[PDB]
């Protein structure tokens, strides 16, 4: 109904305004922290190095910024456009995740990126639906074995369907939300909260880019970097299936 | 179809590897240059400041990089707010749309925690509204097309081709309104190039949301109504991008 959709517009609008109020309340008081830190680093350096004027340090910092802004990395193997990192970057596109922790610097890069995505995303969506159906099949089939137990326990077939859905997501959650977060905690030296934040930002395809796992491989742990890709693939499909059915439940309501 | 799933997987895999090759070819050289420039900047600073060890300068740079990475601005030493009501509103929008530009990061654990639940609840809610607007927007377009379609049928063009021509007009005008119109708008408003603007538009409507480009984010602009109003476009554009792709899928099936 057109009347109802106008209502829905207004609701969402309120969900946004309410969100805005909360983020502002939680984040505005720390808007300036990074400047402060930068200034502290400057002031500290000046005090140690009397041969340096504040102004000269300033120019150094600008020049450093320009280089970092072109993709340079502070050095003390780190190429974001070597084959593996470019592979990853392409992934971030067709998944629509779009971390963007590494920006394209060339107009050709941008141009190509347009067509790469237009063709890549739907192509990926297809594979994702495919893996979603196949993964759900495997899950629902395994859960079917546990369902056998509930039906013998004379639990109503309607609730058994519900228990299995709860199980369906709960086990996925365990495998694709919980398991990875614990993995990343140890691997990335993130906090539990940072890791879940990452995971969920990732699987929702929000892809902020403030946290990113698998862009580069780790020596002394080869299986890491692929498993992450494998994970994203499987996790996105699990997440998709949940959204389609929760989308499914919602639209009829 | 298990056979097809494996074929599809292999295809995508090749789409990625092919993408990787191209991005590396287009971007690595610029990156390798920036890395060189960073090192030139260091070497130049050492030659001018004998009180400074390379290793000490390295630490300074790492520290500067971290701060810039956290959104510090090289140019000033310290009015405008990234978390004012309008920008926070916008930020919330970037979540539920799953676009996730991320040009301003959350710094607080509360911010992150809240962001998780905000999205889990926000995205499906939005998906619903989007489907709604997609159907309603397509309806309104289809109704408007009908009157001009009357003219084609009288001109004795077959009903099968008139349907095709109308689709062309259907998308061409949508494209005009939601792709072309905005890109021309942003070109003038953001001082981007045409190519940058289309890049932005498309990165946006695909929900990739890299965050290298973000409309309204510019600090200098005195443009309060601008940034949410752009969201008005985002809403309309996303749904159209969606609804059309949905109906295309149905026609294919």
């Amino acid at each position, epitope marked *: 109904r057109s009347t109802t959709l106008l209502a829905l517009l207004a609701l969402v609008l309120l969900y946004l305004v309410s969100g805005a109020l909360v983020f502002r309340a939680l984040e505005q008081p720390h808007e300036q922290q990074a400047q402060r830190e930068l*200034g*502290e680093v400057r*002031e500290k350096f*000046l*005090r140690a190095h*009397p*041969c*340096v*004027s*504040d*102004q*000269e340090l*300033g120019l150094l910092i600008k020049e450093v910024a320009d280089a970092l802004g072109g993709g340079a990395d502070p050095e003390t193997s780190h190429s974001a456009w070597d084959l593996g990192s470019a592979f990853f970057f392409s992934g971030t596109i067709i998944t629509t995740i779009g971390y963007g922790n590494v920006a394209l610097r060339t107009d050709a890069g941008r141009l190509f990126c347009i067509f790469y995505a237009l063709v890549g995303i739907p192509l990926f969506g297809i594979l994702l639906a495919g893996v979603g159906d196949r993964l759900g099949s495997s899950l629902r089939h395994g859960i079917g074995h546990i369902e056998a137990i509930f039906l013998k326990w004379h639990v109503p077939p309607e609730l058994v369907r519900v228990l299995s859905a709860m199980l369906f997501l709960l086990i996925g959650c365990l495998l694709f939300v919980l398991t990875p977060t614990f993995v990343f905690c140890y691997m990335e030296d993130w906090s539990k909260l940072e890791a879940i934040y990452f995971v969920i930002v990732t699987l929702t395809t929000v892809g902020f880019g403030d946290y990113v796992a698998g862009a580069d491989p780790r020596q002394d742990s080869p299986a890491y970097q692929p498993l992450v890709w494998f994970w994203i693939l499987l996790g996105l499909a699990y997440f998709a299936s949940v959204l389609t059915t929760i989308g499914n439940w919602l639209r009829v309501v | 179809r298990s056979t097809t799933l494996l074929a599809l997987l292999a295809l995508v895999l090749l789409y990625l590897v092919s993408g990787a090759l191209v991005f590396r070819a287009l971007e690595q050289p610029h990156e390798q240059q920036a890395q060189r420039e960073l090192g030139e900047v260091r070497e130049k600073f050492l030659r*001018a*400041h*004998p*009180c400074v060890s390379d290793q000490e300068l390295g630490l300074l740079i790492k520290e500067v990089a971290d701060a810039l990475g956290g959104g510090a601005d090289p140019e000033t*030493q*310290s009015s405008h707010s990234a978390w004012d009501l309008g920008s926070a509103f916008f930020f919330s929008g970037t979540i539920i749309t799953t676009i996730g530009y991320g040009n301003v990061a959350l710094r607080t654990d509360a911010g992150r925690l809240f962001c998780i639940f905000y999205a889990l609840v926000g995205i499906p809610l939005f998906g619903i509204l989007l489907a709604g607007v997609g159907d309603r927007l397509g309806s309104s377009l289809r109704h408007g097309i009908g009157h001009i379609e009357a003219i084609f049928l009288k001109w004795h063009v077959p009903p099968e081709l008139v349907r095709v021509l109308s689709a062309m007009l259907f998308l061409l005008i949508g494209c005009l309104l939601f792709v072309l119109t905005p890109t021309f708008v942003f070109c003038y408003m953001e001082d981007w190039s045409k190519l940058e603007a289309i890049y932005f538009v498309i990165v946006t409507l695909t929900t990739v949301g890299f965050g290298d480009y973000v409309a309204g984010a510019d600090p200098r602009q005195d443009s309060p109504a601008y940034q949410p109003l752009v969201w008005f476009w985002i809403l309309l554009g996303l749904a159209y991008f969606a609804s059309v792709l949905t109906t295309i899928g149905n026609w294919l099936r």
Partner: antibody, heavy 116, light 107 residues
Framework: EVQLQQSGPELVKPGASMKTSCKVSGYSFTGYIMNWVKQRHGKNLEWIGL????????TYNQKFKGKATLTVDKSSSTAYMELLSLTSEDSAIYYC?????????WGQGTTLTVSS | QIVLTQSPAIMSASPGEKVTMTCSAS?????MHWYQQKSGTSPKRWIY???KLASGVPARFSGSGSGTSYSLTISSMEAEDAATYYC?????????FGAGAKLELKR
């Protein structure tokens, strides 16, 4: 005993320019930033600008951008300020002082008198 | 650009009296420095980085403050303390000075 020895008082006609000096001893000239400061009779101190004796780099107060030119002679560890197009408002005491965050040593000052 | 206000511009103290002069900044700085000047002669770094004493300085002097408000204090005035004290900042280029506070002996 660090010491910044400024040259003597100078008297010049309006319009002329004038160059004044500050010879440092007791430390290494090129290791520290040199500044100059203006004090018009018994009033606020005004930073004119700085030079880095080692690199030649200079920056100036906007107020003094056109007015003052800082230079150094490394061999004689001496710093120079030139003032240009002098007007009556330039009559003051001028100091060389050392520092990149606080001004830890000052010359004894030199008095400039601009008058017809 | 950053403006430093010292007020009042004049004050007076008997010997033994405690003396406090303040420096308020148009916007925040991380550190404040102070100079002592006696007529006839150049300023002397007196206190730097807010609360560090320069070499010569006797203990009766102290400094404190943060953000936008800083102070210089004499626990117990002495005769040789009569002078003009200036604050200055360099957390933002260009460095700037207060307009000074003149401290005379009471009688």
């Amino acid at each position: 005993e660090v010491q910044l020895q400024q040259s003597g008082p100078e008297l010049v006609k309006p319009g002329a320019s004038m160059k004044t000096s500050c010879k440092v001893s007791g430390y290494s000239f090129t290791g520290y930033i040199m500044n100059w400061v203006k004090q018009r009779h018994g009033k606020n101190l005004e930073w004119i600008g700085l030079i880095n004796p080692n690199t030649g780099y200079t920056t100036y107060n906007q107020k003094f951008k056109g007015k003052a030119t800082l230079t150094v002679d490394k061999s004689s560890s001496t710093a120079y300020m030139e003032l240009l197009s002098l007007t009556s408002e330039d009559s003051a005491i001028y100091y060389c002082t050392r520092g990149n965050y606080v001004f830890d040593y000052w010359g004894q000052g030199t008095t400039l008198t601009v008058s017809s | 650009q950053i403006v430093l206000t010292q007020s009042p511009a004049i004050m007076s103290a008997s010997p033994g009296e405690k003396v406090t002069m303040t420096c308020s900044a148009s916007s925040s700085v991380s550190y404040m420095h102070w100079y002592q000047q006696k007529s006839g002669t150049s300023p002397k770094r007196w206190i730097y980085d807010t609360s560090k004493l320069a070499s010569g300085v006797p203990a009766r002097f102290s400094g404190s403050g943060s953000g936008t408000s800083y102070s210089l204090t004499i626990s117990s005035m002495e005769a040789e303390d009569a002078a003009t004290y200036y604050c200055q900042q360099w957390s933002n280029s260009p460095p700037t000075f207060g307009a000074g506070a003149k401290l005379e002996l009471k009688r």
